[PDB]
Every structure is written in C-alpha cells, then in structure tokens.
Amino acid sequence: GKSHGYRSRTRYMFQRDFRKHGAVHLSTYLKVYKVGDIVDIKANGSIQKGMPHKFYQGKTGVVYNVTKSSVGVIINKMVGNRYLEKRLNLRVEHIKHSKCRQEFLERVKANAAKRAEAKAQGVAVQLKRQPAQPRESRIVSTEGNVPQTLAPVPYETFI
Amino acid sequence: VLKKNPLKNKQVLLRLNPYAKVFAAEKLGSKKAEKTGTKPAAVFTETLKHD
Amino acid sequence: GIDHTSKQHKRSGHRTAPKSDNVYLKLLVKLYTFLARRTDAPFNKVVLKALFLSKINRPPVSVSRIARALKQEGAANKTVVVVGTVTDDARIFEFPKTTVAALRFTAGARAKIVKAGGECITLDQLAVRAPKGQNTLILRGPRNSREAVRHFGMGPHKGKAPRILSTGRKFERARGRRRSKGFKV
Amino acid sequence: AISKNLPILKNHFRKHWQERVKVHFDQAGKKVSRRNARATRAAKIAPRPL
Amino acid sequence: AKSKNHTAHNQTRKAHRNGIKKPKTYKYPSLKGVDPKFRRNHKHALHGTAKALAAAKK
Amino acid sequence: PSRFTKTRKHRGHVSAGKGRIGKHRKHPGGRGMAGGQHHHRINMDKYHPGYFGKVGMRYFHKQQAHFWKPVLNLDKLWTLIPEDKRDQYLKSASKETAPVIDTLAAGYGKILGKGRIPNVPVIVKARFVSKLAEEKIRAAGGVVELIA
Amino acid sequence: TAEQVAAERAARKAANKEKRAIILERNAAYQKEYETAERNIIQAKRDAKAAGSYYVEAQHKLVFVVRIKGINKIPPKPRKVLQLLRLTRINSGTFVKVTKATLELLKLIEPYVAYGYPSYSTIRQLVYKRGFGKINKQRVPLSDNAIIEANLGKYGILSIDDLIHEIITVGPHFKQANNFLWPFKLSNPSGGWGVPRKFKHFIQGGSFGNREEFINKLVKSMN
RNA sequence: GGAAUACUGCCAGCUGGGACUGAGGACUGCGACGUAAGUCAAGGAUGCUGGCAUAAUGGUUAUAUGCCGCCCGUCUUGAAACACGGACCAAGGAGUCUAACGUCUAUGCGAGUGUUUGGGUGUAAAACCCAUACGCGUAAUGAAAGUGAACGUAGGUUGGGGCCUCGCAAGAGGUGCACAAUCGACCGAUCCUGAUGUCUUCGGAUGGAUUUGAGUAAGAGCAUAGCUGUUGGGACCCGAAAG
RNA sequence: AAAUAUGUAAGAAGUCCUUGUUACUUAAUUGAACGUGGACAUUUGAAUGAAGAGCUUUUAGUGGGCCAUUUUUGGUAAGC
RNA sequence: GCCCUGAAAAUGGAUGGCGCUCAAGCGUGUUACCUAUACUCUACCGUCAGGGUUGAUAUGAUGCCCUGACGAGUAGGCAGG
C-alpha cells in the first residue's frame, strides 16, 4: 500500500547543491539570532538533527525562542479554512536571516533621514514608493540613425 | 425626483457650469488655429516614401 | 446580473428594540430614543442600546462593585449608572454615599445604599438630572462569569468543563483524563 | 446514538413503565378526605385532643 | 459496488465561504515553549522594574 | 403549544424537515449509548474525556453526611449575627462584651478563610476551622472555640 | 426673527454668487490649459519633423475600462480583479490610472473588458450624463455642484468640471476623485459592436483588449 | 506653385420627422432672461377642442387564430421515459406526549432562590395563606487521608466605550467598567526545601519548580415559561424472514 | 533551467536620543529582555478596492456526485 | 486548393425541412438588418441600509416621511401571514 513517511517525497528537496557537499562553512554558525528576527527556513540534509519537516521548506517565519543550538520559529500554516499557528525548533544550519527584512530596515533609516533633511529645510518630503510610471514624451533624432527598413523573410529549410 | 441631463436641457447645463454661456457666445467649440508653415525635412519624406 | 461580493438582504445583527413587552421598559426606551436622537452626548446612545439587551447580557452589578468603582481617582462624586439590576453584597462593610441609577434594586441594595445616606434613582429620573449623562459612571456586570460559559469551546486540551450532570470520581475521570488510563485529554 | 456536545442522560425507561404511572389527580380529593376524617375523629374523641 | 475514492473538488470553494481570515495577532503573545531558565529570570527582572516604578512614586 | 411548532409550518412540504436522501429512519447508529468505543468514539473523547474505565477506591455502604460539614468563609461570618444587633458589636468592638456566634447552630461545619473581616473581636464556636481562618479571627482579637 | 432670515438668506445668495464666479474663473482656465496643451503637442510634432526628428508622445496616464462579459463562468483571479476595479456588471465602466501596478490588472482581465484612452469629450459626457457620486454608500446623481463640493471640496474640486479635470489630467487626488464616481452604467452600444464576435481581441476582429483611441467611439454609443 | 476634396476628429452650432413615459401634489432649492416691473423650458404636464349613453370603455367567460406548452409524485450524476405508485370521488390519514437535559429568549426575585410532600383556608380539584425541612447556588482540589483562596487602592503592561479637565475648533491631558492579550500574586494536587519544636518520630514553619486543577482575585444564581436541539420511551406513519 | 503557481516584507505594536531593572549573560554596566524621560504625525512611508470591521454561541441538510477546457495515469479502446 | 476514386448493412428519411449550382455551396472582405428574463432610462411590489420626525398642537411611534441599492434556487434554516 501507500507510503507517507516523514521524509517522504524529499529526494531532490533535501539534496545538496551540485559540487557543494560536505562541511558547512562557519558563517552559518556565526550568524546571531534574536527573538523577533525573520528567518527563511531551508533544510540542509547533511545535518539530520534539528531539521524542518518538508512542509516548511521554503517558508519564512519569526524567531520566538533562542537556545544553545537552535531557534524556535513561528510559522502560520493553513489547515482547512484557517491558519493555525505553528512553532518549530530548527537547528541553525537550516535557517537564514530574511534578506528582505534587511532592505526594509535600511529604507526605514533612509526614510528617517530623508525626513530630517526635509524638516531642517522645512520642505515637503514624499517618502512612499510610487510604481513605475507611464513615460514622458521624447524627441528621437535621426543624425546617424536614419531608420533601417526591414521586411519579412521567405521560408527556407536548413536541414 | 427626475434626473435632467445637462447635455439636453440648457437650463441645467447652465446650472452646473456657467462658462458654457461664454463658451457658446465666443464659439471656440469651433475656432481657427493659428497658421504656421513649418516643413518636414527631406529625410522625413525620404523615409516616409522609402521601401 | 451582478457579481455580488456580499450577502444581499443581510440584516444588521443587532437588536433594534427590547424583546420585552414590559410597557414601562418601552417607555424608558421611548425616552432614551428621543434623548439619543436629539442630543449629541454619547451617553444616551450607549444607555439606549443597553435597554435592548437580553437578560444574559445584563448581568447584575453589585453594590461592592459600585463601592470599588467609586474609589477611582476623581470618581467619588459621579453618579453611577447600571442599565440593569443592583444586588446586595454583605462583603463590603464601609459603603459610601452616592447616587445610583438602575433598572432595578434588590431590597438589600436599596437598603445598603440608602442607609449610607445615598440615593436610588430610576433611569428617567437620571434623565432629567442628566440629559447629557453629565458626571455619570456607566457600570457593567461580569458577563462571562455565568455557568453556561464554563462549557464553551469544550475539546481536547481546551481546559473546559464537560457538560456533566452528576459529579465525583466515577464520572468522567478515567480513560482520557489521566496518563494511567489511556491518554490524558 | 451519541451526538453533539450534551450531558449524558440516564433516563431509566427501558421497561414497560407505562404500566405503573401514578398521577395524583386525587391530590385535592384525598385532602378533603383527610380533613373530613380529622373532623370526625375529633368529634367522637369527645373533648380529647387527637 | 465500487464508488468514488477521493477528490479535492469543491474543497476550496467551501474553505473560502467564511474562510481564511489570518492569524489572530497580539502584542504580548504566548510564552509557550520559551526557555524555562530565561523565563524564570525574566520574572525577577519584571518584578524589580515594577518595584522601582512604584519606588518612584513615594 | 403546538400551534407554534415547526411541524405546522412543515405541512405540504413532502418529507417534514428530514431530507429526501437521508430519510428520518428508525434509529441509525444504534440506540442510547451504542458504540461509544466504536463508531461513536470521536464524540466520546472530546466531549467526554474520562468516560470509560475505572479510577479510585470503591467504598461499600457509604453514608453521605457522615461527611456533612458545610463550609462558611470569613468573608461572610458577620451575616450570622442578625442585621439589627450587628451595628452595635461593630462599633463597640470590645474584648469584654464580644458576640458569640454558634456557626454550628447556623448550619455550618467548618469555617474557611476567604475574605477579610473588620477588626472587632468575635467569639467563634465551630467544629473545625481552617488554619488561616483562625489566624484572621485572632488578628482581630477574637478566638475560636471548638465545639461539637 | 422676521428680519433675521434676510441675513442668512442674502448671506448664502451672496456666498453662492462667489462660488459661481470661482467656477466661472476655473472653468475658463481649464479651457485654456487644455487648449494649449493640445496645441503644444501638435507643434511639437511638426518641429521634430522639421528637424528631421520624431516627436514621440507621452504614454497615456489614463484609461477607461468597460466590462463586456456577463457574470457567469468566470475564473477566480480575473473575477477578483474585475471586482477590485468595480466591474461587476456587464457594460459598467470605470477610469483607471495607468501604472505598472494597474497595468498588470488590465492584462489579467483582458478577455472580459474593452478599454482605451478616453478623450475630454467622452469624459465630459460620461460625467455629465451618467455621473453619480457615492455618499454614505448611496449612489447620488451629480445634479448640482454643491454635492461635489460637499464631498470633494476638501481636495479643491468644487464643481463637476473640477471633477472632470482631476480625471483627465490624472493628478493628485485622482484616487479619491475617481472613487467618488460610481461605476458608470452604460447601455449596449447603439449601432452595435461592429464585429461578428465580441470575445476575441480587438486586434483579431474585435471587442476586448485595448482598442486605444477607439474606445471613444464605442463608449459614445454606449453612453 | 497655389488650391480643392476625401478621411478622421471637435463644437456648451442651428434645425425636421417618429415612438414610449407624465411618477409627484401649497411654498421653500440651483438657476436663467430681462434696465426694470416682471417672465421662464429652472427640485416630475399642462392648455385648447371634441366623443360616449339602453353607449365609449373595462372585467369575466366560450370559441377561433399566431406562437409556445411532454405526467405528476419519487429515488437518482441523469426521468416525458421502454424505472416505480397513481382508474375515479368523498370522508380518514403521518415529528406527538412524557422524564431528564444544551443553547438562546422573556419574566420574577437576587447571594440567594423554589408557596402546591404537607398544613391553613375556601364562593371547593380553583383562588388565597404558611412552619420545618429539602434542592440548586454561594469553594475548590486530591484516588484518598486531607488541606482550602488579598504582598499590592484585589497587582503590573497594552488596547477600550463612556465620563472629567483645557480648548472657539482640531485637538491634548485625566479616569478608565465590559471585553481581549500578556506578566505576576492566592487555594488544592505533585515534586523539592525541612526552620522554631517534640517524647526520636511526631511536627511541617519558610522558600521554590519548562509540572498540574472543570479554582481565587468586590459573588450570579434559583425558579416559571417558549422556540430549536439531545437521550430513553410504540417515539413521524405503515412494513420482515424470525424468536 | 523556465512559464503558471508559492513564502515574507512595504512601519505608532514604528523610528531615534537619554538611562532604569535582573537571580539570565558577559573579562567587564558587557549583552539580552522589559521599561521611565525626551524628539519626530501633510505623502506616516507603493497600487486598487472596501458594498462597514472584529467577535460569540448554537443548530439544519450533506457526507453516491457528474460534466467541459487544460495537465494527467491505467487500457487497443470506450458515452471506460 | 476545390472536385473525383479509395467509400460495404440491414423498416423509408433526413445540411432541422423545402429546395439551392456566377448558390441558398467553399475561402475572404464590407455595410445594413432581426432578436433574450442581459444592458440603459422610467413606473410599481418587496428586501436591506442610511436619514428625518409626537417640541406644545385628533385619527396608526412596532408609525409617518426622505434617500440609495438590491431580487435565481433543491436539501435546508429563519420570518410574516
């Protein structure tokens, strides 16, 4: 009959990257984690302890606990018509600071600053992002760029 | 009690937006453009009529 | 047709009037809906609504509970309003003066309040004195203190009370309630 | 059959109970009797106390 | 008679009638599963800062 | 009364309230508490955790009220003196003429310790007191007298 | 009492006089704005030509979108988009400000709508004939400038022509102005769709997708 | 070289023909035209003329004509079905009542509440009256022996309606019941600590712990009634082969 | 190594400055948590929409499904 | 490309039928026209929502009045009759 073990379906998911097998470099053990940090989970199948179950591969949550060798992470998982709150104890080999929370904090600073120079000039700011806008009129010149005219091409076999 | 359409019925046309009075009076829904002579340059016609 | 985004002909989920047929209550209502409509004053809007509430949602406010609220800084002279009934409580000894407007006083509560030199007012009487609710303290009973609510949300690990009719060891205390008997909860 | 979140009742009626129901319609009657008896006992009890 | 065996058909229609909402977020969340030593010391930390706040009210 | 009854509102819909497919049949699932360990177990754990199995010691021929000992908290206590005579003792508050309170007379069997009492001394006759109960009476300058 | 009314009465009569004069000033100034923007663009083009260059016009900042499919059998994603754009009924239409975050919406929806670049004419007539505003839910015909000022005054915009201007120039309160305008309820086009089948693209023989300037002709016959 | 025309688009440019509608019911509004008094097509039709009386007209009904229209009820993914019941008509004919309950509501009283086993009384199964009890509630936790609810304005933090103060407004500060989240304290269980004592084995203060409870932390309940729902009952009605 | 689908973020529960508490932690008032006091509200931190948002209790029916485009398995195939 | 051969089944019979051959056939283009319980505007019924109004002043305050939107339905829930 059917088979649904814990690591069922995981052959390509927990595999190591091509020409990247072996010891895990120390950077991984030098990152510091704080309650409230945002991490992305991604299994390292060379470290079998403290390992996220495969549903959580590729998912991002919040740190809620810090321990000798692991962080606890809060993931919101959808079961039925409702998210349930899940907490995971992942070892550090399987976790990584979320890079987008970093752009975000950087921008919050940038924002505070833009606000500062604006006030200490007493001017309007405009701090929120606009999306890509239509495009304004241009004049293209023809100096050195007299348009080359093209036509469709006859069918032909190359075999 | 009854929506009247300013686009028929000049009365409510004038009620919303005066200006209409002057708009009409001065014409200007017609109104001649100025007149310039500007010619296209050689190259523009060379390539219009290219191949 | 229309791709409706929301239930059509849905009725606000709120009482619009008391379910009671007590003429007097309707009159208090008739009073307050004039007041609610014709003054600004958040107070009457609140008191209006509270008149519609069913009995489970007017839990009683007790006389010690009024004693306590009166100890709020800057509250001692407020007139305390209970859109429901006030009950006696042999547990406070020293009880202070004030003026309590309520729908109903139990006999002991009237006594208590009165004996301490205070006054018992009905809501229309409170209306004339305070058409805008000036210097009032609205109080509400503990609603989730009710026996019914002990059993809500009953389930594995929920910490709730079974709907049992009869209690002791021998009634729902064995398999599923202790590690030694199957599992625990 | 067991359903919903309800108390477990133990209503003992598995048994022909309908052959032994006692509805006391005689409540009022027996009382009038009890008194009429108390009356006439005291009667023949001369001035004794009952 | 054999009958049908499984399907998800209709299940998302059903989940989305009332469904999905999201988490139920609070400030001051469940300290469930947080390091016992740590918590035990947090207690004392909080007691003390409470103490002092009241000490600065004479 | 029957005229407020959905059975009247169902006259003319085939089938009463009960469905075309499922029918109202004559006991599916069995009678009474059938299959509580079988097809009715989900309802029975959840809803009735603890139901099956034993726990504890049997006791043959137990006589309720060998165990009679109804409790009264300090919390009340003054309620046992009647309303009128209550003000005087409260105000007087003397060790020389302090009120007896036969708690057993009043129907109680033990005085527990929830609550505060005013300072006033009280003579409390009871059979059984809690450790704290006696401690609060004494702080107010009354005593407990054990009776039976 | 018998006196007083004349105070408040001749007050507002006077207040009205001034409001009306402002609209007169404004409406005359928008005529100019428009008249010279358009003229500007025309001369731009002739000058480029004259320089042997090509003027290339600004990309459109604004579109009108009309839903043209009825309401059954619609896939969930376009269905949501149709609603977020307030298009939950066949032939109803709205204005959309074009940017990347909205352009990808129009893409998802393309089989179910016809859209394009509305002219002032078309906008003027859409708003005059079928302009209604949203005011405590309720849908209210814009039949006096007082109604517009009472809800849109807080952003400038105190006439129906103030409204048209915030629409056609897009610009700073377009969000709020445009939202105040209820979805336009168009009729079926008088004179027809001009194609044997609506549910192909305009490029493929017709209805659906961006027909560009040709939206004016279509909307005019629907309005 | 100078025009014209087409095509496409704009006009708050002017006009003809046809069709449906005419909701509202003193006045209030926004305007327009007037030098003016006034006028108006400006928050929904008026004016002038005529026609009909054993009638114009309207309802009904029968029939014809155009188009359209399969037999209901049932189970079913699918019935007009070459699935089943039903020839016709009257009368009869199926979710009840009871014991015990969940939720919600109304009502009485409220730390209590329930007169009706019984007594009193009577205009006699009614209505009126009541002593002692008892039930449920007001204490929990342990298998149990047992023990049993305030460090604190009955605690701290964050939201909170309402109220208070300043303010012409916007606002700002004060206080914040209900309710929600979180940290703490108190009672019992469990496991530790084991003081002052004592008869030497009793006693168990005090202080603790990712443990545990259907608890405490200024009570809500008791009772009557109704719909809906639960279980036992012939249990919505009618039906075995059997025993 | 796509396309389609998919996780998180886009702030008042935020930011910055000052310096309080602890039995944790550090060589270390060092960190970590939680705070006092002070400053910053026009676009306060993309878009579009919101027909109001949040929450609680309780209960019916159902628990034979079938069809189409597209993806797709068994089968020569099937209105399988 | 169109057309022809390849091209055999049982009652008599089906581009829906008649019939149609520079089509009433096949490919393509352009206009006009017909028509749904859909769209637009208006009346009326109901439902939901928001708002006004017994302040002293005859006859319904669960009433009167103003405004906007909405209407498919088995099993089934509730309501008003």
Curated annotation (Swiss-Prot), chain B:
Subcellular location: Cytoplasm; Nucleus
Effect of K8A: Significantly diminished nuclear localization
Modifications after synthesis and translation: N-terminally acetylated by acetyltransferase NatA.
Reported impact of K4A: Significantly diminished nuclear localization
Impact upon substituting K21E: Leads to an inefficient release from ACL4 with a delayed assembly into the 60S subunit
Function per UniProt: Component of the ribosome, a large ribonucleoprotein complex responsible for the synthesis of proteins in the cell. The small ribosomal subunit (SSU) binds messenger RNAs (mRNAs) and translates the encoded message by selecting cognate aminoacyl-transfer RNA (tRNA) molecules. The large subunit (LSU) contains the ribosomal catalytic site termed the peptidyl transferase center (PTC), which catalyzes the formation of peptide bonds, thereby polymerizing the amino acids delivered by tRNAs into a polypeptide chain.
Further remarks about this protein from its record: There are 2 genes for uL4 in yeast.
Domain comment as written in the entry: The eukaryote-specific C-terminal extension harbors a nuclear import signal and delivers the ACL4-uL4/RPL4 complex to the pre-ribosome, triggering uL4 release from ACL4 and incorporation into the 60S ribosomal subunit.
Family: Belongs to the universal ribosomal protein uL4 family.
Name of the featured protein: Large ribosomal subunit protein uL4A
Gene this chain is encoded by: RPL4A
From Swiss-Prot, chain E:
One GO term of the biological process aspect: cytoplasmic translation
InterPro entries with a match to the protein in the record: Ribosomal_eL29 (IPR002673)
Name of the coding gene: RPL29
Location of the region described as Disordered in the Swiss-Prot/TrEMBL record: 1-36
Protein name, per record: Large ribosomal subunit protein eL29
Misc remark: Present with 51100 molecules/cell in log phase SD medium.
PANTHER family assigned to the protein according to its UniProt record, in alphabetical order: 60S RIBOSOMAL PROTEIN L29
Crosslink position(s): Glycyl lysine isopeptide (Lys-Gly) (interchain with G-Cter in ubiquitin): K51
Keyword Zinc-finger among UniProt keywords: no
Organism per entry: Saccharomyces cerevisiae (strain ATCC 204508 / S288c) (Baker's yeast)
From Swiss-Prot, chain F:
Any Gene Ontology biological process: cytoplasmic translation
Subunit structure of this chain's protein: Component of the large ribosomal subunit (LSU). Mature yeast ribosomes consist of a small (40S) and a large (60S) subunit. The 40S small subunit contains 1 molecule of ribosomal RNA (18S rRNA) and 33 different proteins (encoded by 57 genes). The large 60S subunit contains 3 rRNA molecules (25S, 5.8S and 5S rRNA) and 46 different proteins (encoded by 81 genes).
Species for this entry: Saccharomyces cerevisiae (strain ATCC 204508 / S288c)
Subcellular location: Cytoplasm
Bias (Basic residues): 1-13, 20-29
This protein's encoding gene: RPL28
GO molecular function terms listed in the Swiss-Prot or TrEMBL record: RNA binding; structural constituent of ribosome
Protein name: Large ribosomal subunit protein uL15
UniProt keyword terms in alphabetical order: Cytoplasm, Isopeptide bond, Ribonucleoprotein, Ribosomal protein, Ubl conjugation
Gene3D superfamilies: 3.100.10.10
From Swiss-Prot, chain G:
Keyword Cytoplasm: yes
Pfam families in the record: Ribosomal_L30, Ribosomal_L30_N
Gene3D superfamilies with a match to the protein in the record: Ribosomal protein L30, ferredoxin-like fold domain
Alphabetical keyword list: Cytoplasm, Ribonucleoprotein, Ribosomal protein
UniProt key word Transmembrane helix: no
Chief localisation class: cytoplasm
GO biological process, one term: cytoplasmic translation
GO cellular component terms attached to this protein's record: cytoplasm; cytosol; cytosolic large ribosomal subunit
Role this protein plays: Component of the ribosome, a large ribonucleoprotein complex responsible for the synthesis of proteins in the cell. The small ribosomal subunit (SSU) binds messenger RNAs (mRNAs) and translates the encoded message by selecting cognate aminoacyl-transfer RNA (tRNA) molecules. The large subunit (LSU) contains the ribosomal catalytic site termed the peptidyl transferase center (PTC), which catalyzes the formation of peptide bonds, thereby polymerizing the amino acids delivered by tRNAs into a polypeptide chain.
Additional free-text comment from the UniProt record: Present with 101000 molecules/cell in log phase SD medium.
Protein name: Large ribosomal subunit protein uL30A
Species: Saccharomyces cerevisiae (strain ATCC 204508 / S288c) (Baker's yeast)
